[PDB]
A paper describes a structure:
Protein gradients play a central role in the spatial organization of cells, but the mechanisms of their formation are incompletely understood. This study analyzes the determinants responsible for establishing bipolar gradients of the ATPase MipZ, a key regulator of division site placement in Caulobacter crescentus. MipZ dynamically interacts with the polar ParB-parS complexes, forming a subcellular gradient with concentration maxima at the tips of the cell and a minimum at the cell center. It inhibits polymerization of the tubulin homolog FtsZ into the so-called Z ring, a structure that forms the basis of the bacterial divison apparatus (Erickson et al., 2010). MipZ belongs to the Mrp/MinD family of P loop ATPases, a heterogeneous group of proteins that act as nucleotide-dependent molecular switches (Leipe et al., 2002).
The two independent structures show excellent agreement with a root-mean-square deviation (rmsd) of 0.44 Å. Superimposition of the structures reveals that MipZ, Soj and MinD share significant similarity in the region constituting the nucleotide-binding site, with an rmsd of 2.4 Å across the 176 α-carbons forming the backbone of the conserved core. However, MipZ differs from its family relatives in the arrangement of several conserved loops. In addition, it displays a number of unique features, including a marked extension of helix 2 and a large loop between helices 9 and 10 (helices 10/11 in Soj). Notably, helices 6 and 7 of MipZ correspond to a single helix in both Soj and MinD (helix 8 in Soj). At the junction of these two helices, MipZ exhibits an unusual structural motif, consisting of a large loop that is stabilized by a short antiparallel β sheet (S6/S7). Together, these distinct characteristics are consistent with a clear evolutionary separation of MipZ from its two relatives. MipZ has no C-terminal amphipathic helix, as used for membrane attachment of MinD, and lacks the conserved DNA-binding domain characteristic of plasmid-encoded ParA proteins (Gerdes et al., 2010). Interaction analyses showed that MipZ monomers bind to ParB irrespective of their nucleotide state. Monomers are unable to interact with the nucleoid and, consequently, display high diffusional mobility, thereby rapidly returning to the polar ParB clusters.
Numbering used by the authors: 4 to 273
C-alpha cells in the first residue's frame, strides 16, 4: 500500500480539489483507494465523497468510489475532543485502509495537529498544493530577498523534514517523495514571472521538494463539488451541469499533475 498525504500550511490553494481528483484518477486506473480526511471541522474531502455516494444512489449510475473512512461516529464533534482521541480514531481508520486498499489518500487541514504530524510521518508521497505567488511561497519558507537563500523553513516544511529524518533513521520503508504542486494564477503579472520561477527553484533546492504543475482555479470544480463529481467523471452518461468545454484544459492539467507525481501508469479517466 502507498500512502499519499495532501497538505499545506493554511489549507488553501485548491488542496481538497486536488486531493479528490487524485483519488478518482487512481480509481479509474483500477486501484482500490481509501480516503481519510483529517480536516475534522470542514471535512471537504469526506463531504465530497458523501455527495458522490448520495448522487450516484439517487441516479442509479455506477462510477468508481473510494473507501471513505471516518475517524469516529461524528468527526465534526471529534475536532473539539482531546488529541489523544483524535489519534486513536486515526490509527483505527489507517489500520482499516492498510488492510483494504492499494493507495491511501489522506487530506490534511491547515495548521499543525498530532494527526497531521502522524500522517506526514507515514507518507510515501507528500503533495503540497501551492499558489504561484510570493506570499504563498512563505508557507514553504522565508528567503533572503537578495540571495534567495532559506532563512527559516515554515512549520509545515519542518514537519515534512521530521518525517524524512525519521524515515531515514528507521530504514524499513523507502524514502518519501515530496512534490510541491504549483497552481498557476490568472492574476500573476508577467513582470514577476522570472522572480517567481527563481524563488520556487531556490526553495526547492534548500527545502528539498520537487516541483510539479497544479490546477488553475476554475468555476467547474465548484459547480461539480456538491455532486461529488470530478472532471474525470464527465461523460455522456454523467453531466450534472450544463455541457461546456470548460473541462478540457482542466483534464490536460490533471494529466500533467499526475505525471509529475509518478502516477501516470496508475491513473485513468472515465
Amino acid at each position: 500500500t502507498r500512502v499519499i498525504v495532501v497538505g499545506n500550511e493554511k489549507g488553501g490553494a485548491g488542496k481538497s480539489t486536488i486531493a479528490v481528483h487524485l483519488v478518482t484518477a487512481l480509481l479509474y486506473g483500477g486501484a482500490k483507494v481509501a480516503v481519510i480526511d483529517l480536516d475534522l471541522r470542514q471535512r471537504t474531502s469526506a463531504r465530497f465523497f458523501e455527495n458522490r455516494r448520495a448522487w450516484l444512489d439517487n441516479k442509479k449510475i455506477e462510477l468508481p468510489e473510494p473507501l471513505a473512512l471516518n475517524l469516529s461516529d461524528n468527526d465534526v464533534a471529534l475536532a473539539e475532543r482531546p488529541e489523544e482521541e483524535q489519534v486513536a480514531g486515526f490509527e483505527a481508520a489507517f489500520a482499516r485502509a492498510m488492510a483494504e486498499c492499494d493507495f491511501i489518500l489522506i487530506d490534511t487541514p491547515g495548521g499543525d495537529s498530532a494527526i497531521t504530524r502522524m500522517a506526514h510521518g507515514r507518507a510515501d508521497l507528500v503533495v503540497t498544493p501551492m499558489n504561484d505567488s510570493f506570499v504563498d511561497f512563505d508557507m514553504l519558507g522565508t528567503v533572503d530577498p537578495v540571495t534567495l537563500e532559506l532563512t527559516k523553513p515554515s512549520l509545515y516544511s519542518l514537519t515534512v523534514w521530521e518525517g524524512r529524518k525519521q524515515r531515514a533513521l528507521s530504514g524499513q520503508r523507502q524514502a518519501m517523495d515530496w512534490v510541491v504542486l504549483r497552481n498557476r494564477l490568472a492574476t500573476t503579472e508577467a513582470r514577476n514571472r522570472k522572480r517567481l520561477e527563481d524563488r520556487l527553484n531556490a526553495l526547492a533546492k534548500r527545502v528539498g521538494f520537487r516541483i510539479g504543475p497544479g490546477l488553475r482555479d476554475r468555476v467547474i470544480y465548484r459547480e461539480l463539488f456538491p455532486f461529488g463529481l470530478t472532471i474525470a467523471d464527465l461523460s455522456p452518461q454523467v453531466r450534472p451541469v450544463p455541457v461546456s468545454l470548460q473541462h478540457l484544459a482542466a483534464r490536460q492539467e490533471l494529466r500533467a499533475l499526475m505525471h509529475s507525481l509518478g502516477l501516470s501508469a496508475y491513473s485513468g479517466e472515465t
